[PDB]
Write a protein that binds this ligand. Structure first.
Ligand code: HEM
Ligand code: HEM
Ligand SMILES: O=N[O-]
Ligand SMILES: O=N[O-]
Lengths: 181, 181
C-alpha cells in the first residue's frame, strides 16, 4: 500500500519533541504520533488530528538528479536515526495553476531544491508523500529522519529552503519534531 | 470535490453503446454508466464494476501548450456532444520508474501527444482523471465527448495515439462508448 497515516495523540511509535507552527494554522500539541500504513477511516479516540498521504511517481527530478540521489540517499529506519521531523506543507493556488515547466523552473532552476538537499545527504533520510489530491488541508507530508549529530545541519537546511523562491508559494507549514521510541 | 466515480450497471445518465476490450482484461458489459462526483465505497446492488479517479494538476503540459489548448478546447456538456468515450488506461511499471525528463520526452517529443490531440479540437471535449495513486487497477480514466459527426475523427485519433511510442508502455486499455440519455 502507498497510503500512510499520521495520528497525533497519546499513542504511537514516535514521541513528540515539539511542534513549531511555522506558517498558518498549526497542529495541536500531542504526546505521540502513530504512523500506520494505509488509510484510517476511524480516527482513534483520544487523538487530536490525522494526516494522511500517499507515495507517488517522480514529478520534477530528472534522470541525472535521480542517479545522484540514489547514489547517496540513506535507507529509512537506521539504528542511529532516532530523531525525525514531519513537515506538512501547503502551496498556494497560484502554484498549482502554473504549467509544468514554470513549476520546474522555480523548483530547481531558481530554488535548486535538489542540489541544496543533496548537500545534507547521507546524513538525513527522507520520504515524500502527496495528499492534495486526497482533499487534505495540506498538499504534502515530508518526513526526515537523522541522528542527533545532524540536528544542527537539518536546521541549517530548513533555513536555506525557507529563503528560496519555491517557498514564496508555501501557504501553510508545521514542524513536528519526533523521537524514536 | 475532485473525485469522480463511474458505476457500470443498470442505471445512470449514459447508455453503453459498446465496450471494446482493446488490451488486457476487459470491463463487463452493462446497460448504463452512472457518473457521480465523489467517492463511492458502497457499489450499488445492481452494478457490475466501479471506476474512480481524481482531477489533478498538470504533469507534462508546458505553458505555451496550455495556452494553445485553452484557446480552442471546448467545454463539457455541450448540447450537441451526445457521444462519449471512457477509456481507462494502465501504464507499465517501466513507465512509472522513469524520471520526469524521460517521461516528458516520450509523451511529447516522440509521441507529440498534445500536438496530435490539438488537431481534433474543438470537436472533442476531454477530461483527464488520475487513479494509480488511489490503488486502482487502472492508472487513468480518460473521458471524451463529441457530436456524432466527429465519431470518425475520434477513431482516427485512437489509431494515431496507439501507434505512438507512448502506447508501447500501455498494458491495459478498454473503450466504453456511451450515448447521453
Ligand atoms: C534533505 C534533503 C532533501 C532532498 C535530497 C530533497 C529532494 C527532493 C526532490 C528530488 C524532490 C522532487 C520529487 C519529485 O520529483 O517528485 C523534492 C520534493 C519536495 N521536497 Fe524535498 N528535498 C530535501 C529536503 C526537503 C525539505 C527540508 C523540505 C521541507 C522543509 C522539502 C520539501 C519538499 C516538497 C514540499 C516537495 C514537493 C515539491 C512539489 O511537488 O511541489 N524537501 N525534494
Ligand atoms: C483528443 C484530444 C487530446 C488532447 C488535446 C490531449 C491532451 C493531453 C494533455 C495536454 C495531456 C497532459 C496532461 C498533463 O500535463 O497532466 C494529456 C494526458 C493524457 N492523455 Fe491526452 N489528449 C487527447 C486525447 C487523448 C486520447 C484519445 C487518449 C487515450 C486514448 C489520451 C490519453 C491520455 C493519458 C493516459 C494521459 C496521461 C498520461 C500521463 O500522465 O502519463 N489522450 N492529454
Ligand atoms: O523531499 N522532501 O521530503
Ligand atoms: O487526454 N485525457 O482526457
Amino acid at each position: 500500500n502507498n497510503r500512510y497515516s499520521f495520528i497525533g495523540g497519546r499513542t504511537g511509535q514516535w514521541q513528540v519533541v515539539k511542534i513549531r507552527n511555522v506558517l498558518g494554522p498549526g497542529l495541536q500539541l500531542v504526546e505521540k504520533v502513530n504512523i500506520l500504513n494505509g488509510a484510517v477511516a476511524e480516527i482513534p479516540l483520544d487523538s487530536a488530528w490525522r494526516l494522511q498521504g500517499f507515495a507517488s511517481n517522480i514529478r520534477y527530478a530528472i534522470r541525472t538528479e535521480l542517479e545522484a540521489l540514489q547514489a547517496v540517499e540513506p535507507m529509512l529506519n537506521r539504528a542511529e536515526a532516532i530523531l525525525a521531523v514531519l513537515i506538512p506543507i501547503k502551496k498556494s493556488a497560484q502554484w498549482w495553476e502554473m504549467a509544468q515547466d514554470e513549476r520546474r523552473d522555480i523548483f530547481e532552476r531558481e530554488s535548486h531544491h535538489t542540489a541544496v538537499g543533496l548537500e545534507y545527504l547521507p546524513g538525513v533520510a527522507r520520504r515524500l508523500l502527496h495528499c492534495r489530491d486526497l482533499g487534505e488541508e495540506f498538499d504534502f507530508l515530508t518526513w526526515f529522519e537523522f541522528a542527533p549529530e545532524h540536528s544542527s545541519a537539518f536546521n541549517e537546511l530548513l533555513l536555506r529552503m525557507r529563503a528560496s523562491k519555491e517557498w514564496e508559494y508555501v501557504e501553510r507549514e508545521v514542524e513536528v519534531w519526533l523521537k524514536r521510541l
